[PDB]
Amino acid sequence: TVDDILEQVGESGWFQKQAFLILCLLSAAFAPICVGIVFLGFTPDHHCQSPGVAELSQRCGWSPAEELNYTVPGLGPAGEAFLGQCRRYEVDWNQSALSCVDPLASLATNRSHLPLGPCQDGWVYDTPGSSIVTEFNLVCADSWKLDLFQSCLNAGFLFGSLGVGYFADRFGRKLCLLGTVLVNAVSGVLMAFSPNYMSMLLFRLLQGLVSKGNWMAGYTLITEFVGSGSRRTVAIMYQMAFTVGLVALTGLAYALPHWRWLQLAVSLPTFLFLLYYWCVPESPRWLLSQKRNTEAIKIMDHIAQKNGKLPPADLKMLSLEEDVTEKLSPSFADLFRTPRLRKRTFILMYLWFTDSVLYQGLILHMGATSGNLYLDFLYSALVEIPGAFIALITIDRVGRIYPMAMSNLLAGAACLVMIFISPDLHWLNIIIMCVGRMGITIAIQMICLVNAELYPTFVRNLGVMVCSSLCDIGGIITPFIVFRLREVWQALPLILFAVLGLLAAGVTLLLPETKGVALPETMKDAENLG
Ligand SMILES: CC(=O)S[C@@H]1CC2=CC(=O)CC[C@]2(C)[C@H]2CC[C@@]3(C)[C@@H](CC[C@@]34CCC(=O)O4)[C@H]12
């Protein structure tokens, strides 16, 4: 009966726009946590630091180009670039060379007979700004610890997703928003003032613990607040905030080259939401799922007062249809109580894992697009807009199962097309990648809507975090899987991606259709889904 009161009081009102903006704020302050390693951990051109090279450079006044050419051993990178970015000339350069204009008097090739040692004086970087690998020297033998950032972030995602999902289900959406936003702000603030890498790793673990739960608790609140018809328009445009945050992250990263200033800049919307927190109330469906009737009635009265429309006479005694107890049972065994619910939970878990694996693979496989890193990130980020608009015009017309199925089938076909596509005519390969990424983004938005729609209110956050826990596992194992499979066969990850996409497209058809259906409230209501 919550939807009837929402319709009588007026859904998608001005207060709904205000709540939409202030809750989509999180979605804009969530991208630097997830994908901020692109700008906080970019690896510039580097080589070994030789004290004798600088003396000759100051003596002859050499320009940095030919000084770099005559200084590094590996002028030609040849892919690995270990001779340029790890090798140091053991022959001294402080003494006057035979010819300071590109000296080669060490040997016939000046590298074959001259011994090549590792870096001893540190590293230099050809960039006006700073980064993680710039500050902590993570380029030659410490390059594997750059991936530890994302690894700790995803492990925190998993663990804190489960924990914060249970916390949000038990103590409500508002208290979870308080806790996760506080820990996110603290974690960013001491991220930007971390002396060592271990402190950063611990704070990245904490950010992974709270950030995903914060984002999807806000998404769950903003989904439950609107009626049956505006769920599409709210849940699709909630990721417009993420896209806008991606664009703003790129712009502020171009504005601020140093990573500490970037973290200060991206830690600000969380504090400004802390300043503007009191403008959102709790979800009335969760309040009715806790036998707190008068708080939900007060929330409806406040919404009526803010919207300018008088509350109806039936707004009082707003209660559940068959409320018999507190309905406080957020359980991990609640999801697998029924064979139907266990089937849909396993389907959503496998679908989340497949979508995460496919998204990470499609992101990683295409990285040869040259130019600026900021322009590459803009091209990767702006491609989600037309597919999301295609979604926003196709959920209402078709539904929530067929667009997801087609999108997964299109992603699998695109993974099965670019394998047989020649390396020549790169424009076709780029547009095929773009089509596959478009379908993947549509499928991710569809599963984000469907996961939230197909669960009871008192199970919803915990059940989604259980279903979405396989995304972080896929994010962890995907780079290792693609690396070892690429070592085995040049195209084996592509066939595995196509197989996973085809099986995911086949699997999602067994999900119940939830087009034009109100959110379930009791245990029996979700058993009736589809
Ligand atoms: C990098 C990833 O793995 S997904 C990324 C983070 C994430 C992890 C979860 O487990 C929970 C859900 C999320 C928040 C996704 C939600 C949907 C996002 C925002 C996606 C990035 C782009 C997409 C699809 C197209 C669009 O319009 O926005 C989110």
Side-chain angles (χ1 to χ4, degrees), residues 1-3 5-54 57 59-61 64-66 68-69 72-74 76-79 81-82 84-86 88-89 91-92 94-97 99-100 102-103 105 108-109 112 115-119 122-125 127-313 315 318-322 324-328 330-341 343-420 423-424 427-516 518-530:
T1 177
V2 187
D3 316 279
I5 307 295
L6 274 165
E7 172 259 309
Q8 292 221 352
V9 84
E11 59 99 19
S12 74
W14 149 256
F15 154 76
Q16 188 41 245
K17 311 290 178 37
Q18 167 186 2
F20 173 80
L21 293 174
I22 180 156
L23 283 170
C24 284
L25 177 159
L26 293 55
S27 181
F30 186 56
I33 289 97
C34 268
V35 308
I37 193 176
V38 186
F39 293 132
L40 267 82
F42 70 100
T43 314
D45 298 340
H46 45 268
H47 45 280
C48 266
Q49 174 147 5
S50 298
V53 162
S57 157
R59 181 251 312 276
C60 263
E66 79 286 344
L68 184 136
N69 180 36
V72 313
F82 280 158
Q85 308 180 350
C86 289
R88 198 181 84 158
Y89 269 131
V91 188
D92 62 358
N94 203 4
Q95 203 57 59
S96 305
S99 309
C100 84
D102 288 347
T109 61
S112 294
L116 292 184
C119 268
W123 279 271
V124 316
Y125 306 91
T127 181
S130 304
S131 170
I132 284 167
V133 305
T134 284
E135 289 264 329
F136 295 151
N137 293 359
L138 260 47
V139 304
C140 170
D142 306 341
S143 191
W144 70 274
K145 324 162 81 63
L146 188 49
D147 200 272
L148 286 191
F149 217 56
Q150 287 298 94
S151 289
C152 286
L153 172 68
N154 285 347
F157 278 150
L158 173 85
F159 295 144
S161 69
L162 298 187
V164 169
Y166 184 78
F167 185 81
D169 203 290
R170 177 75 166 80
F171 296 96
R173 265 56 140 164
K174 285 311 284 304
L175 295 188
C176 163
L177 279 197
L178 220 69
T180 48
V181 162
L182 286 201
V183 181
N184 235 35
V186 161
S187 287
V189 155
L190 299 317
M191 199 150 290
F193 297 133
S194 80
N196 322 297
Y197 197 48
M198 255 329 267
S199 52
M200 292 177 72
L201 284 180
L202 257 292
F203 295 145
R204 200 69 175 174
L205 192 55
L206 260 71
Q207 253 190 358
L209 291 186
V210 293
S211 295
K212 181 172 141 173
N214 171 46
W215 184 91
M216 153 91 66
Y219 176 83
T220 292
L221 168 62
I222 210 180
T223 284
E224 290 175 339
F225 240 77
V226 291
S228 56
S230 304
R231 239 148 38 210
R232 158 202 93 249
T233 321
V234 165
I236 296 294
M237 202 155 38
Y238 192 79
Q239 284 124 357
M240 280 325 99
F242 202 89
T243 295
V244 158
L246 287 169
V247 170
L249 155 76
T250 304
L252 277 57
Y254 172 73
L256 313 175
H258 287 55
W259 75 269
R260 289 190 194 280
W261 300 339
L262 189 50
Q263 192 83 350
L264 295 174
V266 304
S267 280
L268 289 191
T270 301
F271 276 129
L272 164 154
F273 168 74
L274 228 41
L275 155 79
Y276 304 143
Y277 160 96
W278 300 104
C279 275
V280 277
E282 215 142 338
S283 45
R285 300 152 178 278
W286 186 88
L287 287 191
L288 290 196
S289 291
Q290 293 301 321
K291 270 279 265 169
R292 283 153 78 181
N293 275 13
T294 204
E295 214 178 319
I297 295 157
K298 174 192 310 322
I299 281 185
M300 301 285 78
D301 261 340
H302 171 86
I303 291 167
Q305 278 178 20
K306 202 187 273 151
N307 266 278
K309 314 172 52 173
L310 259 69
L315 188 131
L318 177 64
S319 60
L320 204 63
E321 303 94 7
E322 208 254 339
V324 297
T325 179
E326 189 132 298
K327 195 52 91 153
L328 188 130
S331 175
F332 296 87
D334 191 295
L335 298 162
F336 319 101
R337 174 161 331 290
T338 317
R340 293 183 185 178
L341 260 164
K343 176 248 282 182
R344 89 182 40 166
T345 306
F346 291 146
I347 279 177
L348 285 175
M349 253 161 49
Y350 165 73
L351 202 55
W352 261 118
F353 170 73
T354 302
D355 282 336
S356 156
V357 159
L358 281 192
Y359 179 73
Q360 279 296 321
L362 283 188
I363 281 311
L364 164 147
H365 262 277
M366 171 36 67
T369 298
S370 307
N372 298 105
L373 167 66
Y374 324 100
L375 257 73
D376 206 349
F377 207 58
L378 284 178
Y379 287 171
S380 172
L382 277 162
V383 84
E384 315 175 347
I385 284 174
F389 277 27
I390 281 153
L392 192 129
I393 74 186
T394 200
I395 327 180
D396 188 8
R397 265 69 138 182
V398 201
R400 278 163 180 82
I401 304 305
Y402 301 95
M404 183 176 282
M406 297 304 302
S407 303
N408 267 342
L409 150 67
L410 176 128
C415 279
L416 209 44
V417 152
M418 69 171 57
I419 172 177
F420 294 110
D424 288 359
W427 52 273
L428 189 129
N429 207 342
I430 290 300
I431 206 179
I432 282 312
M433 162 55 197
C434 285
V435 162
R437 173 95 185 281
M438 203 156 269
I440 279 301
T441 48
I442 298 181
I444 288 184
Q445 294 184 338
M446 291 324 317
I447 190 184
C448 263
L449 188 43
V450 160
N451 193 189
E453 282 215 339
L454 292 189
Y455 276 131
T457 288
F458 79 109
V459 180
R460 162 139 48 231
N461 255 304
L462 175 67
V464 154
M465 291 294 78
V466 163
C467 293
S468 165
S469 78
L470 258 294
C471 174
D472 318 328
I473 292 165
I476 280 175
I477 312 288
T478 297
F480 305 136
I481 186 167
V482 70
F483 162 70
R484 303 290 270 111
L485 271 43
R486 186 109 51 80
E487 157 263 319
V488 167
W489 191 318
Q490 314 271 19
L492 184 56
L494 275 206
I495 312 128
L496 164 149
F497 288 159
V499 161
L500 270 187
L502 264 153
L503 187 50
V507 175
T508 168
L509 306 155
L510 329 181
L511 276 174
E513 190 97 20
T514 166
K515 187 239 167 221
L519 302 103
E521 295 267 310
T522 202
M523 282 297 300
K524 190 171 70 172
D525 278 335
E527 303 289 0
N528 307 348
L529 293 177

